[PDB]
């Protein structure tokens, strides 16, 4: 510190001699020793740890620096003045673009789990804001831009409803919890002005929402309290001025339909004071076009889908059995069973099955629909055993049921115990199929039985088609031909003239459910059943092309755009499920490592973090356990650790490590429940330490210490330097709890910041700092 | 070269490029003779019977085409009438010894599929039109080269089967069958039927 | 911790040498690292010298960590360094630590005599 | 039963900081073991070397430096012993042949490539030769009575009785690929999806049938999803390969319909036909983290064709490797009787390694344990021999051991029977 002060005084005196003179190379040499001392990382670290013990000499340092800067800036040089500016910046250094990751995280949560809790999303977004240090206006701007872009790119149908509910109901609650968990109104107002500059985005959005969606946004953020009212009014004035250059739109329907979700909960707690005709009227208004979807989108975006499912499940349990009745009352109760069943199947097929589960049932009294969905309904990753014991309840009831279906119209709907009937249809149509395969039943009687099934109550067709789909999936190719005809009659157009009530709407919902049940089996053999898009992201892969070409093409297009689409998110999910985690993560990292530009490498990493957020935990285990030790240990591989991809890769590894430590799709939940591995055996290692991530991190830090300690420094040593430096910079304070203490010594033997940050700067802490930084 | 020598040898051979450039008849790949049946073969047109390459003096770095099999010269000579002894003098065939020369066999097959292509172009605008003349000359030439076992029958037929693929070559299949009939009718009694 | 062959060598050294362990470098593991010294009225003060003794020390030769930059900036230290590399090439294989230290002291003495 | 020798690497073990990989092992008809191991010293190509060990050689191990950029999934010798197919993750099937007819110099000129897709099953095509051993005619004094050819047809006969040679591989996507080697150096490749519903194939296996049909079984590891089956028919249409697939009856697995505690054993870990050319029986191995179940199934007809279970073990340790026999016994009822009376047990055993040291030689038909060998660390790869008297095995270290199994499985026989 004193020699730096003497050097500053030498530059001041030599520059004064230069001013009096006007070869004065003394200034050139003085500045050369300034930049040669200060250019080293050792010396600037030593001055920074020298700062603490000698306070107020730094003031004299900077005042001499200011007078030096004046006397040099008056007499500029073609080379020395730039040098003096550089050294001034160095002595001050001792004590953008867009942000694609927030974009793709928001678009991922919109596409995959609308029904996820907001706290997980707030935790993930705060994480991303802390990893790469993001200002708050640009952060909220990227949230709004992602939401609007995903709304515009949404396919028409229920996905447009889910995206309108996601922007207008899920995102303000996220910003509210960000306001809690962190001067937010000024920042969100700044971000709204940032957004209101983007007139083409907002006009494309306005053409899709057929109204001023920015007006509804500003009134909604006013209601939540993100924005002050004066801000809201001048923003709406600006938007109207920029805008100047009969059916309700979906946003008004959703914003008014969320209070109807709450009030429909509170009024149908009590079965309309046990008036089932009122229930029939309200539920018939629900099955009128798009009203169910609007309620479900609002309830999903606002966290109340679970209570909605509990309410319809309890209604179903109430209408299962039969009270003592005549002809008319039972014909209302069976319709209540149909409406509750079909809406529950539609919920379970759209928003996943885990909102239907009760998650704790004290006592054995699990409802009928939960067990039926558990053991009998096809989902995406669920294939069913047709001769599971669930599909073989009795032999007694099933003969009564086939006699019931061969009697005529049910006529005996006055007491049916509909759960028993729906559980027995599988065995019933099994015996019907055996009778038709022997030949003892004609095709015309098959038509009669299918009409008796599908006519009075539509849920029977759904239960039968579920068992038929399981049974056709098990069969061979030539043996299928008969059973597919059964689906053609069960899923055919309407049987008429004996319908109870609301028949066409139940037919419409049932045709959707049967589409999503049969689609896979009718993909295996080219069979068109032609029900009436409702499956917008389904069957996305090309039929014959090897799957790495799909992966590299989608990652090339995502890099050249700069953000991840919704369709690209779905194909990336199917490839992660198909080729497995290791293949996926390895091929994406290969496609990283063949980039040569700084800009494209940083963008690729900011996208790949969000792509790996499909299953972050398993991807981190593969990344820090298999990919990185294979790149660091192989002697031929580390030429790929080139600087412009290598710094980016080290950033991605440390972001993945931190986000996995601090701590998501249904395929990934199923597959990790499938997975068996012994991480104690995989990483023998010469807190818990039976948690595999701690084991991978301990193994990786042993590898890093071994690389830093060895001879033959190459690009891999630069890699582990960068990894430790962004471990230091990215942390708040812990991933570095697993670092071996020999790394503390060795890292400044190989050079710096990993000591000057880690020490926490007590008076004794300077002594350990100055010991390590000076001694190489 | 080996990865330790590398440039040290490769550049060295590159400095022998001008000497090879001196010792090359320029345009040698595109010079063609006039086929006379007289014998007394000029030794310029002799090819290597193993690989259809020009025999080259030395180990110099010659130009890249001189290391290719000269199929153009051999097809031009086989397409000429009365080029029977000249093809033997080129490929060193001797007729005291039967050998099953393979590159001759492949060139004859490719000549047949070229005739089949050019017959499938039209063959009906001009009645003579060089097509049936080509098929007659193919009959005579291929009879001689399969008869003395310089090529062989069944490898020729099955390689011919592998070529007639993906071009749908069907308009003059009767001519190809006629040529095969010449071979079978010539030599059914000498060989087993499994040939 | 430290292999006892090295304690036997260091316990028998002449009081010219002042061998101590490096504060820097890995410790209590395979190889060990030494920073020696030289005290002798006859000999001049010289750069400290850095030694890297492998584990399984006998049956192999220790290595002298070369620091060319401090053996510049004088003619005398240059002569010390040239003569020391010469006697190092002259050494038999599988030599001790004391052979290195004694070639160092003899190199300093020759570079005193050759200079004057 | 007994341990003949244990061959270990010297100082080249202690793989550090990089986790283990699964190993391959292949015992040829000539006694040459081809196998890969996790050496992991100064390079990862030390996990991409294919070691050829002549089994009579004391320690002369050849090490082919295969140029496989990812880890070698499958090794597979010929129907003869003269070529070796090796395929890794990311495509790249290579066909190593001898150089100058030395068993120490291998070089591959021929291979296939389905880039990016990991090969998960690999097999040579069947050349139509199959013979059956009648043990009850052991004294019959003529070799035509003892060993008899069983009229099998080769997949893809070409212009004569002569089969084409080639391989068929099944990737981790739905893709299957067939490569046909000509008598000339040419090679024809074709890839085609197995079925239209493209899905994960995490485990796969290949058998052949009479009639020249390949039967390929796929599973996606979940053990609550069906083990699907496809019939593949190869043809050469106008000089190119052509693959025709057709779905067969799938099966589900018991221990999922157990209903007491069905959630256990959630991973199918090994799928194996009982022998290639025995396409009607299937051995499956479900496993949890600690325990496992093997099962045998059969296609047998009555739905005409339908997979029914034969037998299953009670509960085991976690099965780490599985070796099926190669001796083609005649398997019918009289030969089962005479091989139980005269204690001939070479063709009736599978070996099951476990995650403790033990190895169980267990019956083919009803999986009851015939013998037990305690290692005194687990076998990560096992292979029985072609006469099935010795099993080779690579451990969870560098150790490669050859065990001898007695032909009567330890039950003492009089000397005339052992002679016979």
Q: How would you describe this protein?
A:
It is classed as transcription. Keywords: Mediator complex, transcription. The entry is titled "Human Mediator (deletion of MED1-IDR) in a Tail-bent conformation (MED-B)". Chain A is Mediator of RNA polymerase II transcription subunit 24. The structure is cut from a larger assembly and holds chains A (776 residues), B (195 residues), C (116 residues) and D (420 residues). The longest helix of chain B has 20 residues, at 102-121. Helices cover 47% and strands 0% of the residues of chain B. Chain B contains eight helices and no strands. Chain B has 195 residues and is mainly α. Chain C is 35% helix and 11% strand. Chain C is built from three helices and four strands. Chain C has a four-stranded antiparallel sheet with strand order 1-2-3-4, with no helix packed on it. The N and C termini of chain C lie far apart (45 Å). Chain D is mostly beta strands and 420 residues long. Chain D is 4% helix and 45% strand. In chain D, the strands form eight sheets. A four-stranded antiparallel sheet of chain D has the order 1-30-29-28, with no helix packed on it. In chain D, strands 2-3-4-5 form a four-stranded antiparallel sheet, with no helix packed on it. A four-stranded antiparallel sheet of chain D has the order 6-7-8-9, with no helix packed on it. In chain D, strand 13 (165-171) and strand 14 (175-181) form a beta hairpin. The longest helix of chain D is centred in the last third of the chain and has 9 residues, at 333-341. At the A-D interface, helix 28, helix 29, helix 31, helix 33 and helix 35 of A face strand 15 of D.
């Amino acid at each position: 510190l004193s020699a730096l002060h003497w050097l500053l005084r030498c530059t001041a005196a030599s520059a004064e001699r230069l001013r009096e003179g006007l070869g004065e190379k003394q200034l050139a040499m003085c500045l050369q020793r300034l930049e040669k001392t200060l250019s080293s990382t050792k010396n600037r670290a030593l001055l920074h740890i020298a700062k603490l013990e000698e306070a107020s000499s730094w003031t004299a340092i900077e005042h001499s620096l200011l007078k030096l800067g004046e006397i040099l800036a008056n007499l500029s040089n073609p080379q020395l003045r730039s040098q003096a500016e550089q050294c001034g910046t160095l002595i001050r250094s001792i004590p953008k673009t867009g942000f694609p990751t927030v974009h793709a995280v928001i678009l991922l949560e919109g596409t995959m789990n609308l029904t996820g809790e907001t706290q997980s999303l707030v935790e993930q977004l705060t994480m991303v804001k802390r990893m790469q240090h993001i200002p708050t206006p640009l952060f909220v701007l990227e949230i709004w831009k992602a939401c609007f872009v995903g709304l515009i790119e949404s396919p028409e149908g229920t996905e447009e409803l889910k995206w309108t509910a996601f922007t207008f109901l899920k995102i303000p609650q996220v910003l509210v919890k960000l306001k809690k968990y962190s001067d937010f109104t000024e920042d969100v107002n700044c971000a709204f002005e940032f957004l209101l500059k983007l007139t083409p985005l907002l006009d494309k959005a306005d053409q899709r929402c057929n109204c001023d969606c920015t007006n509804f946004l500003l009134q909604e953020c006013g209601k939540q309290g993100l924005l002050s009212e004066a801000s809201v009014n001048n923003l709406m004035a600006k938007r109207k001025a920029d805008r100047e250059h009969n059916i309700q739109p979906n946003i008004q329907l959703i914003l008014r339909a969320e209070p109807t979700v709450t009030n429909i909960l509170k009024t149908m707690d009590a079965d309309h004071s046990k008036s089932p005709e009122g229930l029939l009227g309200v539920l018939g208004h629900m099955l009128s076009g798009k009203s169910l979807d609007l309620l479900l989108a609002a309830a999903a975006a606002t966290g109340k889908l679970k209570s909605f499912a509990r309410k319809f499940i309890n209604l179903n349990e109430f209408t299962t059995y039969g009270s003592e009745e005549s002809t008319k009352p039972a014909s209302v109760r069976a319709l209540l069973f149909d409406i509750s069943f079909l809406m529950l199947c539609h919920v379970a097929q759209t928003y996943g099955s885990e909102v239907i589960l009760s998650e704790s049932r004290t006592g054995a009294e699990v409802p009928f629909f939960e067990t039926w969905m558990q053991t009998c309904m096809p989902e995406e990753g669920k294939i069913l055993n047709p001769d599971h014991p669930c599909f073989r309840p009795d032999s007694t009831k099933v003969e009564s049921l086939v006699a019931l279906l061969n009697n005529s119209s049910e006529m005996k709907l006055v007491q049916m115990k509909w759960h028993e009937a729906c559980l027995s249809i599988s065995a019933a149509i099994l015996e019907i199929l055996n009778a038709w395969e022997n030949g003892v039943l004609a095709f015309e009687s098959i038509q009669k039985i299918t009409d008796n099934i599908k006519g009075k109550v539509c849920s029977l067709a759904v239960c039968a088609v579920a068992w038929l789909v399981a049974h056709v999936r098990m069969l061979g190719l030539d043996e299928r031909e008969k059973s597919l005809q059964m689906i053609r009659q069960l899923a055919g157009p309407l049987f008429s003239e004996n319908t109870l009530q609301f028949y066409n709407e139940r037919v419409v919902i049932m045709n959707s459910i049967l589409e999503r049940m049969c689609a896979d089996v009718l993909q295996q053999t080219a069979t068109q059943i032609k029900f009436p898009d409702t499956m917008p992201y389904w069957n996305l892969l090309p039929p014959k092309r090897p799957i790495k070409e799909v992966l590299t093409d989608i990652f090339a297009k995502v890099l050249e755009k700069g953000w991840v689409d919704s369709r690209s998110i779905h194909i990336f999910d199917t490839l992660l499920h198909m080729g497995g985690v290791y293949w996926f993560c390895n091929n994406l990292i290969k496609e990283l490592l063949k980039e040569t530009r700084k800009e494209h490498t940083l963008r690729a990493v900011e996208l790949l973090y969000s792509i790996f957020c499909l299953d972050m935990q398993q991807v981190t285990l593969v990344l820090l356990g298999h990919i990185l030790p294979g790149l660091l240990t192989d002697s031929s591989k580390w030429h790929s650790l080139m600087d412009p991809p290598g710094t980016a890769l080290a950033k991605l590894a440390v972001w993945c490590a931190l986000s996995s430590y601090s701590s998501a799709s249904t395929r990934q939940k199923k597959r990790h429940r499938e997975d068996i591995e012994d991480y104690i055996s995989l990483f023998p290692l010469d807190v818990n330490m039976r948690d595999p991530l701690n084991r991978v991190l301990a193994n990786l830090f042993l590898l890093i210490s071994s690389i830093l300690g060895s001879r033959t420094a190459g690009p891999h040593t630069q890699f582990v330097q960068w990894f430790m430096e962004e471990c230091v910079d990215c942390l708040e304070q812990s991933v570095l709890q697993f670092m071996p203490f020999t790394t503390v010594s060795e890292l400044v033997k190989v050079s710096k910041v990993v000591l000057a940050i880690t020490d926490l700067s007590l008076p004794l802490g300077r002594q350990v700092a100055a010991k390590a930084i000076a001694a190489l | 070269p080996h990865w330790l020598l590398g440039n040290l040898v490769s550049d060295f051979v590159d400095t022998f490029r001008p000497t090879a450039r001196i010792n090359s008849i320029c345009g040698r790949c595109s010079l063609l003779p006039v086929v006379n049946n007289s014998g007394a073969i000029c030794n310029s047109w002799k090819l290597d019977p193993a690989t259809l390459r020009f025999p080259l003096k030395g180990l110099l770095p010659y130009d890249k085409d001189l290391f290719e099999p000269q199929t153009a010269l051999l097809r031009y000579v086989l397409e000429q009438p009365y080029s029977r002894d000249m093809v033997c003098n080129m490929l060193g065939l001797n007729k005291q010894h039967k050998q099953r020369c393979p590159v001759l066999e492949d060139q004859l097959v490719d000549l047949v599929v070229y005739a089949m292509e050019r017959s499938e172009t039209e063959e009906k605008f001009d009645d003579g039109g060089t097509s049936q003349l080509l098929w007659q000359h193919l009959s005579s030439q291929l009879i001689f080269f399969v008869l003395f076992q310089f090529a062989s029958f069944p490898h020729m037929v099955l390689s011919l089967h592998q070529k007639l693929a993906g071009r749908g070559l069907i308009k003059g299949r009767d001519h190809l069958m006629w040529v095969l009939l010449q071979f079978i009718s010539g030599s059914i009694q000498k060989n087993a039927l499994a040939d | 911790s430290i292999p006892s062959v090295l304690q036997g060598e260091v316990a028998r050294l002449d009081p010219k040498f002042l061998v101590n362990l490096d504060p820097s470098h890995c410790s209590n593991n395979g190889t060990v690292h030494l920073i020696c010294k030289l005290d002798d009225k006859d000999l001049p003060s010289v750069p400290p010298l850095e030694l890297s003794v492998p584990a399984d020390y006998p049956a192999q030769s220790p290595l002298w960590i070369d620091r060319q930059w401090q053996y510049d900036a004088n003619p005398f230290l240059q002569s010390v360094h040239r003569c020391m590399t010469s006697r190092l090439l002259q050494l038999p294989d599988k030599h001790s630590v004391t052979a290195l230290l004694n070639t160092w002291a003899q190199s300093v003495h020759q570079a005193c005599l050759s200079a004057a | 039963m007994d341990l003949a020798y244990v061959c270990e690497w010297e100082k080249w073990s202690k793989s550090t900081h990089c986790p283990s990989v699964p190993l391959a092992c292949a015992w040829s008809c000539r006694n040459l073991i081809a196998f890969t191991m996790d050496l992991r010293s100064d390079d990862q190509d030390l996990t991409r070397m294919i070691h050829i060990l002549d089994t009579e050689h004391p320690w002369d191990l050849h090490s082919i430096p295969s140029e496989h950029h990812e880890a070698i999934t499958c090794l597979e010798w010929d129907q003869s012993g003269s070529r070796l197919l090796s395929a890794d993750a990311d495509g790249q099937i290579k066909c190593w042949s001898m150089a100058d007819h030395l068993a120490n110099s291998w070089e591959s000129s021929v291979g296939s490539l389905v880039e990016g897709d990991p090969i998960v099953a690999l097999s040579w095509l069947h050349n139509g030769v199959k013979l059956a051993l009648h043990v009850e005619k052991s004294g019959a004094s003529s070799f035509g009575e003892k060993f008899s050819r069983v009229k099998f047809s080769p997949s893809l006969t070409l212009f004569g009785g002569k089969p084409m040679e080639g391989w068929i591989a099944v990737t981790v996507s739905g893709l299957v690929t067939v490569s046909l080697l000509k008598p000339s150096g040419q090679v024809l490749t074709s890839t085609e999806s197995l079925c239209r519903l493209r899905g994960r194939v995490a485990l796969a296996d290949i058998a052949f049938t009479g009639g020249g049909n390949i039967v390929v079984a796929t599973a996606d590891g979940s053990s609550a999803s069906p083990v699907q089956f496809y019939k593949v028919c190869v043809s050469v249409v106008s000089e190119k390969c052509r693959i025709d697939t057709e779905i067969l009856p799938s099966l589900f697995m018991r221990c999922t319909t157990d209903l007491n505690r069905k959630d256990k054993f959630p991973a199918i870990t090994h799928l194996k036909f009982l022998a290639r050319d025995m396409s009607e029986q299937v051995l499956l191995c479900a496993s949890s983290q600690t325990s496992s179940i093997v099962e045998c199934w059969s296609l047998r007809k009555e739905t005409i064709l339908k997979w029914r279970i034969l037998s299953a073990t009670n509960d085991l340790d976690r099965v780490s490797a599985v070796a099926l026999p190669k001796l083609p016994i005649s398997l019918t009822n009289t030969d089962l009787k005479v091989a139980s009376d005269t204690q001939f047990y070479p063709g009736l055993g599978l070996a099951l390694a476990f995650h403790d040291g033990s190895v169980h030689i267990v019956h083919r038909l009803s999986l009851q344990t015939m013998a037990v060998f305690y290692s005194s660390v687990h076998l990560k790869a096992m292979q029985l021999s072609w006469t099935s008297l010795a099993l080779v095995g690579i451990d969870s270290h560098g150790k490669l051991s050859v065990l001898r199994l007695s032909p009567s499985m330890g039950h003492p026989l009089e000397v005339g029977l052992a002679l016979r």
